[PDB]
Amino acid sequence: GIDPFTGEAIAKFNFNGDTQVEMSFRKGERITLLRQVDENWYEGRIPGTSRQGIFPITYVDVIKRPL
């Protein structure tokens, strides 16, 4: 994201969320990383969209971590 504290990732695999709170995406989408919320999940959002939620770290290539 534009906020320099956010991170940046590119989806590495498709991800379908298990429920609403999990954010689905496809490989190749750029994702803003808001927070690494635990040892396995990020909170993030997709630029240009209203898509936002959590997803597992496994499913992205992290380019820049959030601060």
The contact pattern for Cl ion, residues 2-41, with x = CB under 5 A and - = no contact, is: ----------------xx----------------------
Which residue type sits at 42? Answer: Y
Distant-in-sequence, close-in-space partners of 38: CB < 8 Å, separation ≥ 6: none
Show the beta-strand stretches assigned E in the chain. Answer: 7-11, 30-36, 41-45, 52-56, 60-64
The least CB distance from residue 54 to Cl ion, in Å, is 8
Q: Shortest approach of Cl ion to residue 20 CB, angstroms?
A: 7
- Residue span binding Na ion (CB under 5 A) among the ranges 1-9, 15-23, 34-42, 43-51: 15-23
